[PDB]
């Protein structure tokens, strides 16, 4: 595996390894934004993109990128998620906070489907790298190089799946097909975050607040 080695993407994933439920999840979100930058830096060839392009890629992907992270981290827990702060947020705890619909969408569509297929950390990183290298992002000075870097990631990813899991030929496509759900969940998750800010009933830390402010 040449320009985009799965070992380096896995190393990035392993290098970042960690009262009102809505307040706690938000505290964890701001926290994780910092370590998301450190993750992106460790992804091959990302740091070599111009600074302004790098900013666009993170501002467009942060929701999806972080959502995939806490989901795969939660394949272990029964009915809820393990926050990076160390706290656990149960289905019922989230429902009691009026965010049950979206929390359920994460659980059934991501965590479950991750758990079912026992998605590994390498496969996790690759999908996250595919999300990061989004050539559709508005403002990208060189969208063809971001387009080419995505192709490098998913060529590597298919190679890995053919190697590691030859028994399941449809596994590569299975991984890619969680991305529309991840996209959908990400947008609906963004909405909620805007609403918490608009109402201001919830404390929102500086980094999270920064990502929630217009381009």
């Amino acid at each position: 595996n040449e320009d985009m080695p799965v070992e380096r993407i896995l190393e990035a994933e392993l290098a970042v390894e960690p009262n009102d439920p809505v307040t706690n999840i938000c505290q964890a979100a701001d926290k994780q934004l910092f370590t998301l930058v450190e993750w992106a830096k460790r992804i091959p060839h990302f740091s070599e993109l111009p600074l302004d392009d790098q900013v666009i890629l993170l501002r467009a992907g942060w929701n999806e990128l972080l959502i995939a992270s806490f989901s795969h981290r939660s394949i272990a827990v029964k009915d809820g998620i393990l926050l990076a702060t160390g706290l656990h947020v149960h289905r019922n705890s989230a429902h009691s906070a009026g965010v049950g619909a979206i929390f359920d969408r994460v659980l059934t569509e991501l965590v479950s489907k991750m758990r079912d297929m026992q998605m590994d950390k390498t496969e996790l990183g690759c999908l996250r790298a595919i999300v990061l290298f989004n050539p559709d992002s508005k403002g990208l000075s060189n969208p063809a190089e971001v387009e080419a870097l995505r192709e490098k990631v998913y060529a590597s990813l298919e190679a890995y799946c053919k190697h590691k899991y030859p028994e399941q030929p449809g596994r590569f496509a299975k991984l890619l097909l969680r991305l529309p759900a991840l996209r959908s969940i990400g947008l609906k998750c963004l909405e909620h975050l805007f609403f918490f800010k608009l109402i201001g009933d919830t404390p929102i830390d500086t980094f999270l607040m920064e990502m929630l402010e217009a381009p």
Partner: peptide, 11 residues
């Protein structure tokens, strides 16, 4: 123009 993100993207 989003300060924190730029500062962290340096080192």
């Amino acid at each position: 123009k989003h300060k924190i993100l730029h500062r962290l993207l340096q080192d």
